[PDB]
Scaffold this active site. Sequence first.
Site, PDB file in Angstrom:
ATOM      1  N   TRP A 144      41.877  40.885  28.087  1.00 23.29           N
ATOM      2  CA  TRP A 144      40.942  41.734  28.806  1.00 23.29           C
ATOM      3  C   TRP A 144      41.380  43.134  29.173  1.00 23.29           C
ATOM      4  CZ3 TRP A 144      41.727  37.389  32.740  1.00 23.29           C
ATOM      5  CH2 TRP A 144      41.435  36.157  32.147  1.00 23.29           C
ATOM      6  N   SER A 200      36.085  33.841  31.268  1.00 19.93           N
ATOM      7  CA  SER A 200      36.442  32.812  30.300  1.00 19.93           C
ATOM      8  C   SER A 200      36.189  31.451  30.918  1.00 19.93           C
ATOM      9  CB  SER A 200      37.909  32.968  29.902  1.00 19.93           C
ATOM     10  OG  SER A 200      38.180  34.278  29.425  1.00 19.93           O
ATOM     11  N   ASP A 219      42.276  36.283  23.758  1.00 20.20           N
ATOM     12  CA  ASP A 219      41.202  36.422  24.727  1.00 20.20           C
ATOM     13  C   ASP A 219      41.881  37.317  25.736  1.00 20.20           C
ATOM     14  OD1 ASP A 219      38.937  36.262  26.225  1.00 20.20           O
ATOM     15  OD2 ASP A 219      39.440  34.352  27.200  1.00 20.20           O
ATOM     16  N   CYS A 265      46.012  34.643  26.270  1.00 20.95           N
ATOM     17  CA  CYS A 265      44.925  35.062  27.131  1.00 20.95           C
ATOM     18  C   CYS A 265      45.404  35.792  28.369  1.00 20.95           C
ATOM     19  CB  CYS A 265      44.085  33.862  27.567  1.00 20.95           C
ATOM     20  SG  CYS A 265      42.796  34.356  28.721  1.00 20.95           S
TER      21      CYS A 265
HETATM   22  C1  LIG Z   1      36.086  38.906  27.613  1.00 25.13           C
HETATM   23  C2  LIG Z   1      36.530  39.006  28.929  1.00 25.13           C
HETATM   24  C3  LIG Z   1      36.957  37.865  29.604  1.00 25.13           C
HETATM   25  C4  LIG Z   1      37.323  37.941  30.944  1.00 25.13           C
HETATM   26  N1  LIG Z   1      37.739  36.841  31.590  1.00 25.13           N
HETATM   27  C5  LIG Z   1      38.064  36.912  32.888  1.00 25.13           C
HETATM   28  C6  LIG Z   1      38.472  35.776  33.575  1.00 25.13           C
HETATM   29  O1  LIG Z   1      38.268  34.655  33.107  1.00 25.13           O
HETATM   30  N2  LIG Z   1      38.997  35.891  34.866  1.00 25.13           N
HETATM   31  C7  LIG Z   1      39.116  37.148  35.470  1.00 25.13           C
HETATM   32  O2  LIG Z   1      39.480  37.245  36.639  1.00 25.13           O
HETATM   33  N3  LIG Z   1      38.726  38.292  34.765  1.00 25.13           N
HETATM   34  C8  LIG Z   1      38.199  38.168  33.473  1.00 25.13           C
HETATM   35  N4  LIG Z   1      37.556  39.205  32.927  1.00 25.13           N
HETATM   36  C9  LIG Z   1      37.403  40.452  33.712  1.00 25.13           C
HETATM   37  C10 LIG Z   1      36.003  40.441  34.337  1.00 25.13           C
HETATM   38  O3  LIG Z   1      35.022  40.487  33.299  1.00 25.13           O
HETATM   39  C11 LIG Z   1      35.767  41.616  35.288  1.00 25.13           C
HETATM   40  O4  LIG Z   1      36.031  42.854  34.623  1.00 25.13           O
HETATM   41  C12 LIG Z   1      36.643  41.493  36.536  1.00 25.13           C
HETATM   42  O5  LIG Z   1      36.352  40.260  37.201  1.00 25.13           O
HETATM   43  C13 LIG Z   1      36.342  42.665  37.474  1.00 25.13           C
HETATM   44  O6  LIG Z   1      34.941  42.698  37.756  1.00 25.13           O
HETATM   45  P1  LIG Z   1      34.389  43.319  39.136  1.00 25.13           P
HETATM   46  O7  LIG Z   1      32.943  43.594  38.981  1.00 25.13           O
HETATM   47  O8  LIG Z   1      34.830  42.433  40.237  1.00 25.13           O
HETATM   48  O9  LIG Z   1      35.183  44.714  39.260  1.00 25.13           O
HETATM   49  P2  LIG Z   1      34.508  46.111  38.825  1.00 25.13           P
HETATM   50  O10 LIG Z   1      33.697  46.596  39.964  1.00 25.13           O
HETATM   51  O11 LIG Z   1      33.861  45.925  37.508  1.00 25.13           O
HETATM   52  O12 LIG Z   1      35.778  47.085  38.659  1.00 25.13           O
HETATM   53  C14 LIG Z   1      36.692  46.928  37.570  1.00 25.13           C
HETATM   54  C15 LIG Z   1      37.583  48.170  37.493  1.00 25.13           C
HETATM   55  O13 LIG Z   1      38.279  48.392  38.727  1.00 25.13           O
HETATM   56  C16 LIG Z   1      39.413  49.215  38.404  1.00 25.13           C
HETATM   57  N5  LIG Z   1      40.588  48.616  39.072  1.00 25.13           N
HETATM   58  C17 LIG Z   1      40.881  47.177  39.213  1.00 25.13           C
HETATM   59  N6  LIG Z   1      42.091  47.229  40.057  1.00 25.13           N
HETATM   60  C18 LIG Z   1      42.434  48.504  40.236  1.00 25.13           C
HETATM   61  C19 LIG Z   1      43.454  49.011  40.927  1.00 25.13           C
HETATM   62  N7  LIG Z   1      44.159  48.149  41.652  1.00 25.13           N
HETATM   63  N8  LIG Z   1      43.698  50.328  40.987  1.00 25.13           N
HETATM   64  C20 LIG Z   1      42.846  51.203  40.308  1.00 25.13           C
HETATM   65  N9  LIG Z   1      41.785  50.640  39.590  1.00 25.13           N
HETATM   66  C21 LIG Z   1      41.606  49.311  39.576  1.00 25.13           C
HETATM   67  C22 LIG Z   1      39.550  49.179  36.888  1.00 25.13           C
HETATM   68  O14 LIG Z   1      38.962  50.359  36.323  1.00 25.13           O
HETATM   69  C23 LIG Z   1      38.723  47.965  36.512  1.00 25.13           C
HETATM   70  O15 LIG Z   1      38.215  48.134  35.180  1.00 25.13           O
HETATM   71  C24 LIG Z   1      37.213  39.148  31.628  1.00 25.13           C
HETATM   72  C25 LIG Z   1      36.821  40.294  30.948  1.00 25.13           C
HETATM   73  C26 LIG Z   1      36.480  40.223  29.598  1.00 25.13           C
HETATM   74  C27 LIG Z   1      36.047  41.368  28.938  1.00 25.13           C
HETATM   75  N1  LIG Z   2      39.967  40.762  35.475  1.00 20.82           N
HETATM   76  C1  LIG Z   2      41.251  40.482  35.277  1.00 20.82           C
HETATM   77  O1  LIG Z   2      41.747  39.375  35.486  1.00 20.82           O
HETATM   78  C2  LIG Z   2      41.983  41.472  34.630  1.00 20.82           C
HETATM   79  C3  LIG Z   2      41.331  42.483  33.933  1.00 20.82           C
HETATM   80  C4  LIG Z   2      42.061  43.443  33.238  1.00 20.82           C
HETATM   81  C5  LIG Z   2      43.450  43.413  33.261  1.00 20.82           C
HETATM   82  N2  LIG Z   2      44.116  42.415  33.986  1.00 20.82           N
HETATM   83  C6  LIG Z   2      45.591  42.444  34.099  1.00 20.82           C
HETATM   84  O2  LIG Z   2      46.196  41.179  33.782  1.00 20.82           O
HETATM   85  C7  LIG Z   2      47.496  41.176  34.399  1.00 20.82           C
HETATM   86  C8  LIG Z   2      47.598  39.934  35.290  1.00 20.82           C
HETATM   87  O3  LIG Z   2      46.595  39.980  36.305  1.00 20.82           O
HETATM   88  P1  LIG Z   2      46.270  38.678  37.196  1.00 20.82           P
HETATM   89  O4  LIG Z   2      45.509  39.130  38.381  1.00 20.82           O
HETATM   90  O5  LIG Z   2      45.696  37.625  36.331  1.00 20.82           O
HETATM   91  O6  LIG Z   2      47.732  38.202  37.669  1.00 20.82           O
HETATM   92  P2  LIG Z   2      49.124  38.899  38.069  1.00 20.82           P
HETATM   93  O7  LIG Z   2      49.703  38.155  39.209  1.00 20.82           O
HETATM   94  O8  LIG Z   2      48.882  40.352  38.207  1.00 20.82           O
HETATM   95  O9  LIG Z   2      50.022  38.628  36.760  1.00 20.82           O
HETATM   96  C9  LIG Z   2      50.290  37.276  36.384  1.00 20.82           C
HETATM   97  C10 LIG Z   2      51.752  37.125  35.960  1.00 20.82           C
HETATM   98  O10 LIG Z   2      52.019  37.974  34.830  1.00 20.82           O
HETATM   99  C11 LIG Z   2      53.284  38.590  35.108  1.00 20.82           C
HETATM  100  N3  LIG Z   2      53.505  39.755  34.222  1.00 20.82           N
HETATM  101  C12 LIG Z   2      53.390  41.039  34.545  1.00 20.82           C
HETATM  102  N4  LIG Z   2      53.586  41.756  33.442  1.00 20.82           N
HETATM  103  C13 LIG Z   2      53.829  40.915  32.438  1.00 20.82           C
HETATM  104  C14 LIG Z   2      54.127  41.133  31.157  1.00 20.82           C
HETATM  105  N5  LIG Z   2      54.402  42.388  30.818  1.00 20.82           N
HETATM  106  N6  LIG Z   2      54.327  40.125  30.297  1.00 20.82           N
HETATM  107  C15 LIG Z   2      54.211  38.809  30.758  1.00 20.82           C
HETATM  108  N7  LIG Z   2      53.913  38.616  32.113  1.00 20.82           N
HETATM  109  C16 LIG Z   2      53.745  39.677  32.915  1.00 20.82           C
HETATM  110  C17 LIG Z   2      53.143  38.948  36.576  1.00 20.82           C
HETATM  111  O11 LIG Z   2      54.439  39.243  37.123  1.00 20.82           O
HETATM  112  P3  LIG Z   2      54.674  40.486  38.122  1.00 20.82           P
HETATM  113  O12 LIG Z   2      53.323  40.811  38.637  1.00 20.82           O
HETATM  114  O13 LIG Z   2      55.597  39.931  39.136  1.00 20.82           O
HETATM  115  O14 LIG Z   2      55.268  41.535  37.263  1.00 20.82           O
HETATM  116  C18 LIG Z   2      52.680  37.590  37.075  1.00 20.82           C
HETATM  117  O15 LIG Z   2      53.786  36.680  37.175  1.00 20.82           O
HETATM  118  C19 LIG Z   2      47.556  42.437  35.249  1.00 20.82           C
HETATM  119  O16 LIG Z   2      48.106  43.522  34.488  1.00 20.82           O
HETATM  120  C20 LIG Z   2      46.085  42.698  35.511  1.00 20.82           C
HETATM  121  O17 LIG Z   2      45.882  44.078  35.849  1.00 20.82           O
HETATM  122  C21 LIG Z   2      43.371  41.440  34.664  1.00 20.82           C
END
Ligand SMILES: Cc1cc2nc3c(=O)[nH]c(=O)nc-3n(C[C@H](O)[C@H](O)[C@H](O)COP(=O)(O)OP(=O)(O)OC[C@H]3O[C@@H](n4cnc5c(N)ncnc54)[C@H](O)[C@@H]3O)c2cc1C
Ligand SMILES: NC(=O)c1ccc[n+]([C@@H]2O[C@H](COP(=O)([O-])OP(=O)(O)OC[C@H]3O[C@@H](n4cnc5c(N)ncnc54)[C@H](OP(=O)(O)O)[C@@H]3O)[C@@H](O)[C@H]2O)c1
EC number: 1.6.2.4
Length: 608
Positions: A607, A392, A605, A560
């Site tokens: 994810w 994003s 927004d 988001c």
């Molecule tokens: C529309 C959209 C907007 C997004 N915006 C952002 C953003 O702005 N910022 C952001 O950080 N992300 C955002 N993402 C997520 C981003 O697109 C990537 O999916 C993310 O950065 C991970 O990519 P990667 O290639 O590093 O990991 P990848 O190699 O693609 O691996 C991802 C997978 O690892 C697995 N995984 C992650 N943690 C664990 C765990 N601890 N234990 C077991 N499995 C796990 C899950 O299956 C996850 O799907 C967005 C995604 C979408 C779809």
């Molecule tokens: N690419 C990504 O960024 C991505 C992709 C897919 C999903 N997510 C999910 O998005 C969440 C946040 O990830 P992050 O790495 O951005 O930061 P994060 O540190 O994991 O979470 C940000 C904040 O959200 C709080 N929180 C946890 N559960 C919540 C809930 N149920 N309602 C409101 N707040 C909640 C967390 O508190 P505590 O951690 O102390 O509970 C923390 O203070 C996680 O579940 C992560 O797995 C992220």
Amino acid sequence: PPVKESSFVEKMKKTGRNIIVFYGSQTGTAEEFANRLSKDAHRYGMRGMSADPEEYDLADLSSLPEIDKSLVVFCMATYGEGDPTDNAQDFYDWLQETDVDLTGVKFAVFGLGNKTYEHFNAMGKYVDQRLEQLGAQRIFELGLGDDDGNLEEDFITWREQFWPAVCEFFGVEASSIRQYELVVHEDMDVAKVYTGEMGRLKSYENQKPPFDAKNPFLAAVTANRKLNQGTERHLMHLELDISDSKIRYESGDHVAVYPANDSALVNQIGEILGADLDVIMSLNNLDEESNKKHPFPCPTTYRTALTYYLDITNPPRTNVLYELAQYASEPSEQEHLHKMASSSGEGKELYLSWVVEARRHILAILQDYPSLRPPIDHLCELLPRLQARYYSIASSSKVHPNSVHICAVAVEYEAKSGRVNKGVATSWLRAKEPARALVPMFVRKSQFRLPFKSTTPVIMVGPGTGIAPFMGFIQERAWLREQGKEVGETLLYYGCRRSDEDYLYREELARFHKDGALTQLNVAFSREQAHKVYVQHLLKRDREHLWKLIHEGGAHIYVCGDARNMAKDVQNTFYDIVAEFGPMEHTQAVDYVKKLMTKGRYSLDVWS
Ligand SMILES: Cc1cc2nc3c(=O)[nH]c(=O)nc-3n(C[C@H](O)[C@H](O)[C@H](O)COP(=O)(O)OP(=O)(O)OC[C@H]3O[C@@H](n4cnc5c(N)ncnc54)[C@H](O)[C@@H]3O)c2cc1C
Ligand SMILES: NC(=O)c1ccc[n+]([C@@H]2O[C@H](COP(=O)([O-])OP(=O)(O)OC[C@H]3O[C@@H](n4cnc5c(N)ncnc54)[C@H](OP(=O)(O)O)[C@@H]3O)[C@@H](O)[C@H]2O)c1
Ligand SMILES: Cc1cc2nc3c(=O)[nH]c(=O)nc-3n(C[C@H](O)[C@H](O)[C@H](O)COP(=O)(O)O)c2cc1C
């Protein structure tokens, strides 16, 4: 916009195919399922082909009955907010306006969705319902794959009952086959060997607009800084220079990037397989008629394919392990791989815990099943394509017209498989040094937007990295105040663990608050005290004022971040606010909020 191909029905008549499988996919999953179904045809005496609906005119569906025992299948994923995938948008618009009669048409639909999203499998349900309204006949029940459980298993289950139903209906009855042929190239012009580009050969070195998914712009990384204070995780902020690219964007949009897999992981796959990754070659379709001449840009080296074109980090799908079983010289190992495609039993259980749950990538399986020595070319034909990752945009084009900002947390975790798994794109992005460090990218327009009227109040909820688009939102709203415009209330409900560990953009946010761009900076620190404090807790705390902004102020709500739990929790708190102050019953508050979404005043927004 796209020039369509000639009738897919005519192509079927010329190639003796009776089944065509269309895929509506944003990130390649529906595409892979469609290829699998198409290939299955052969096992039942039929002949099929998979196709991209965006390349054809679906109106020709009415000619499909001209082919005996014909059938069309749609593997459709939903995207955005209950919307069609981009490549299915054209098909979707046609379904809504056409009146064409599909009498005689036989169809089946498998939907790819996720139960945690507002409108579960909206696209799949729409296509399935519509074909019937238009007069076609359903030959098999709609499939409802759920990516929140295990989509692969839903497909397997559905596929298992689909073919028997197809065979039964057309009265038809029920050996590894290769789709491509390896051609090793001796002494060729490097000038015609792909090195990682996505479309036109040499498009990465010779950049020429317009830039998009097919022709990504290689933006220079002008900044890459650590955002979090602590060392528990690594949160980063990158700024991509898109100058002279002619790319236009707005806060709320997404920026996609094409990463490179971890070179060391690529070296080990080659090593364990005893193959030379530096061999220049091509994988050509044995079907000289298909538009798909190669599984990925060719010619190229295996190293290049495994680095920029193939996914080598996610858990292999069951069909992949099924095709590899033949290469495992040890019986028990061949048996385990073969049973991964089971619809039930211990084979399914082993697949769910040993491959999926343990998050074992291809290399891990190669190491843990040492008797598995598949030839490198076949493997390359079986691995899925490496997808772009979305982020994003964390900046406003009103303020940074020539730069696209990214806010991301690096993925790195201990898997049950015993090893450390690295996120492809984040590991790749994290290693980019401003020095030039170039990042192939493009912008996808979204529907996440600030209100058109500067005076309309804004309520942003984005914990953790979910704050990304809001940094852009805030910069822009601050920009409008500076421009002498009249800006309504701008409230940010952010959340992190500890203000001294991962408080993202702390300094920037303090500034905006101080200057008045941020009417309220409400931050929930989830771990500074014994109980959890989340953003929804702050929303409930401000229920009276929020209702006032929503009911009388026409405020816009934006959410988001995590779509799995956070989005729903936040949504439920809004239900409670509306329910209490309307007042109304819960069921009515739910309706109320859903209408805010249709009226474009509650955007997401989220994810997965
Ligand atoms: C529309 C959209 C907007 C997004 N915006 C952002 C953003 O702005 N910022 C952001 O950080 N992300 C955002 N993402 C997520 C981003 O697109 C990537 O999916 C993310 O950065 C991970 O990519 P990667 O290639 O590093 O990991 P990848 O190699 O693609 O691996 C991802 C997978 O690892 C697995 N995984 C992650 N943690 C664990 C765990 N601890 N234990 C077991 N499995 C796990 C899950 O299956 C996850 O799907 C967005 C995604 C979408 C779809
Ligand atoms: N690419 C990504 O960024 C991505 C992709 C897919 C999903 N997510 C999910 O998005 C969440 C946040 O990830 P992050 O790495 O951005 O930061 P994060 O540190 O994991 O979470 C940000 C904040 O959200 C709080 N929180 C946890 N559960 C919540 C809930 N149920 N309602 C409101 N707040 C909640 C967390 O508190 P505590 O951690 O102390 O509970 C923390 O203070 C996680 O579940 C992560 O797995 C992220
Ligand atoms: C930004 C985003 C939005 C999504 N929106 C929906 C949705 O509205 N409904 C749904 O059922 N699934 C939704 N999904 C889940 C996908 O439909 C599911 O993960 C599908 O397997 C993806 O297929 P693909 O790789 O073929 O595009 C969404 C996923 C992402 C990443």
